[PDB]
Amino acid sequence: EVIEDEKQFYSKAKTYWKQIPPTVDGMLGGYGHISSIDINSSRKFLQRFLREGPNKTGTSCALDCGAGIGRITKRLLLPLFREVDMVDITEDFLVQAKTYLGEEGKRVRNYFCCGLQDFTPEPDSYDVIWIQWVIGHLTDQHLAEFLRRCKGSLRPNGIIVIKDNMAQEGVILDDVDSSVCRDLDVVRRIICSAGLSLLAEERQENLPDEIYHVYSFALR
Numbered sequence: 001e002v003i004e005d006e007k008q009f010y011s012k013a014k015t016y017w018k019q020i021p022p023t024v025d026g027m028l029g030g031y032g033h034i035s036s037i038d039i040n041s042s043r044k045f046l047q048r049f050l051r052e053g054p055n056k057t058g059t060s061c062a063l064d065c066g067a068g069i070g071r072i073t074k075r076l077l078l079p080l081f082r083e084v085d086m087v088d089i090t091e092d093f094l095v096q097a098k099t100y101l102g103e104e105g106k107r108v109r110n111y112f113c114c115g116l117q118d119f120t121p122e123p124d125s126y127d128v129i130w131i132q133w134v135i136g137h138l139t140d141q142h143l144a145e146f147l148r149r150c151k152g153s154l155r156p157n158g159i160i161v162i163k164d165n166m167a168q169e170g171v172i173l174d175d176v177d178s179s180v181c182r183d184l185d186v187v188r189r190i191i192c193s194a195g196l197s198l199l200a201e202e203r204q205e206n207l208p209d210e211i212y213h214v215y216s217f218a219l220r
């Protein structure tokens with residue numbers, strides 16, 4: 001109901017991200033000062049599955065969805081995992097990632113340039129599949145199909161993490177960058193509709209009151 005034709009929905013957002021500077025501040029819509037707050041909370045939220053316990057999550061390989069120039073790949077994933085794959089729809093950001101990442105960018109194993117609605121991660125490949133601030137660009141059915149494909153790419157004890165914006169009441173339409181913001185209910189329905197289990201749900205604090213609410217979901 002909030003998407004009249006899907007072809008124009010994707011084509012408008014892809015054009016939007018072509019004209020965005022490959023800087024950290026451009027990845028977050030002009031909020032690059034919160035990158036340190038985000039990464040550190042994502043670091044804590046990720047130890048829940050990395051520390052000792054019954055079902056320890058591996059550290060062999062990870063997949064960053066959205067990624068951009070590698071803001072999360074550089075600060076969060078590359079320190080913790082041996083190899084990291086990146087996937088994005090904007091080729092410019094992946095090219096600029098080779099510079100932004102630096103010496104450690106040599107451990108980035110693959111750069112995929114295509115949309116999540118068309119991306120199929122290899123099975124039995126990743127210990128962590130990080131999906132941050134990008135789900136608002138997919139349709140409700142493509143997001144469920146994508147999460148269904150990610151489940152088959154997880155290694156034993158692997159997890160899927162979704163950290164994106166959540167609306168307070170209703171679906172908020174942002175035609176500035178061609179994205180939809182959803183509430184916790186529709187997201188959890190889509191998550192459950194892919195056959196995934198809720199393992200943890202945490203809300204990011206220490207955030208400006210102008211941006212949306214941000215929640216993290218741990219799935220497998």
Ligand SMILES: CC(C)(NC(=O)O[C@@H]1CN2CCC1CC2)c1csc(-c2ccc(F)c(O)c2)n1
Binds near residue numbers: 133212
């Ligand atoms: C940092 C954050 C969370 N700000 C925010 O709250 O939104 C703001 C409202 N307005 C749009 C996005 C900024 C600036 C202008 C942000 C930046 S870019 C982004 C996003 C976009 C599209 C997506 F599909 C997605 O998953 C995520 N979120």
Ligand SMILES: Nc1ncnc2c1ncn2[C@@H]1O[C@H](CSCC[C@H](N)C(=O)O)[C@@H](O)[C@H]1O
Binds near residue numbers: 010087117
């Ligand atoms: N339909 C789509 N399929 C795959 N990636 C998309 C997409 N629409 C937007 N993106 C990517 O999602 C990012 C939007 S915000 C980038 C957030 C980034 N993942 C981070 O580390 O914080 C852009 O890099 C854009 O190229």
